[PDB]
Amino acid sequence: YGSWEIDPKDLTFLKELGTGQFGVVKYGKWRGQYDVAIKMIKEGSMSEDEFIEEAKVMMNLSHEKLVQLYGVCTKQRPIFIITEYMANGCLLNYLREMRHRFQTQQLLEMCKDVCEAMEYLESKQFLHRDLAARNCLVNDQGVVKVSDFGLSRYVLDDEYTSSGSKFPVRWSPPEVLMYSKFSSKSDIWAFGVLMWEIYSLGKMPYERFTNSETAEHIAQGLRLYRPHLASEKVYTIMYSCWHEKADERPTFKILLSNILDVMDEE
Numbered sequence: 001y002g003s004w005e006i007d008p009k010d011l012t013f014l015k016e017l018g019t020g021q022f023g024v025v026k027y028g029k030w031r032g033q034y035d036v037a038i039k040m041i042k043e044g045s046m047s048e049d050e051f052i053e054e055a056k057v058m059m060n061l062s063h064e065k066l067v068q069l070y071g072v073c074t075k076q077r078p079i080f081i082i083t084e085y086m087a088n089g090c091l092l093n094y095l096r097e098m099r100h101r102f103q104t105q106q107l108l109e110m111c112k113d114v115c116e117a118m119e120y121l122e123s124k125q126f127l128h129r130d131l132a133a134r135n136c137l138v139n140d141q142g143v144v145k146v147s148d149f150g151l152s153r154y155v156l157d158d159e160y161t162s163s164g165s166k167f168p169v170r171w172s173p174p175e176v177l178m179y180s181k182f183s184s185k186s187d188i189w190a191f192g193v194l195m196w197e198i199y200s201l202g203k204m205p206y207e208r209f210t211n212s213e214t215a216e217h218i219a220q221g222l223r224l225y226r227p228h229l230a231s232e233k234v235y236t237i238m239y240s241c242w243h244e245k246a247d248e249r250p251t252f253k254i255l256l257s258n259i260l261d262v263m264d265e266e
């Protein structure tokens with residue numbers, strides 16, 4: 001076993017967490033003690049040799065607000081990815097549970113959580129490439145962490161690969177939709193949409209539009225507008241992520257400073 005390789009015999013499987021496009025995720029314990037999520041990759045869904053090679057590099061990414069990679073199990077099929085367990089599940093579902101009766105202070109904290117993780121990724125020149133509420137998780141303390149960062153690079157499903165009937169049109173800037181120009185600034189754009197999702201309690205962005213109409217709306221320079229729960233200062237931050245010119249969008253370090261400033265002002 002290399003440093004990136006976990007012995008699957010050290011795993012105890014405890015509960016089903018869901019079955020989806022990329023495979024089956026279970027809750028379990030490593031060496032009888034430590035909570036993990038065990039992601040069992042659906043056969044045929046991933047460029048597996050590339051994914052395994054990249055998993056070695058990503059063992060070196062670690063941040064409090066980034067879902068922690070513990071290792072992979074590649075000596076058998078399906079391959080497993082072993083990651084941090086996030087007891088409250090997908091952020092999108094969490095936002096849509098109206099019982100939580102969130103305060104806007106909690107919503108801003110969720111944005112700060114994500115922004116800190118993305119600032120760390122940016123400091124490593126690492127792109128998420130599909131940042132959205134559906135790719136964040138929530139732990140038992142209500143902390144939001146960023147999940148599946150970079151994963152889209154190894155997804156074989158062509159409907160998801162290109163501006164594709166499963167492509168994240170609603171989280172993409174004009175230069176991605178027009179030219180496939182991915183950069184730090186397309187992560188910045190997606191983060192602004194993510195803030196919008198949070199302050200909209202999990203509403204679909206451009207709710208009344210198809211993907212095709214959304215791209216046209218963007219093409220004409222039009223935008224999402226202010227969620228009822230977002231203050232003017234919060235809206236200014238998410239809106240700054242959507243400048244038509246990628247180079248005029250902020251960095252995650254600047255977004256983080258802006259978010260902290262608004263938290264102090266409340």
Ligand SMILES: CN(c1ncnc2[nH]ccc12)[C@@H]1CCCCN(C(=O)CNc2cc(Cl)cc(Cl)c2)C1
Nearest residue numbers: 017022023024025037039040041084085086089090
């Ligand atoms: C309910 N969830 C969790 N709950 C609790 N703890 C957790 N840690 C990690 C995930 C997690 C996830 C909710 C998000 C949607 C589904 N999901 C995923 O992890 C999807 N991504 C994925 C799946 C596979 Cl099988 C393989 C690959 Cl490469 C990627 C499970």
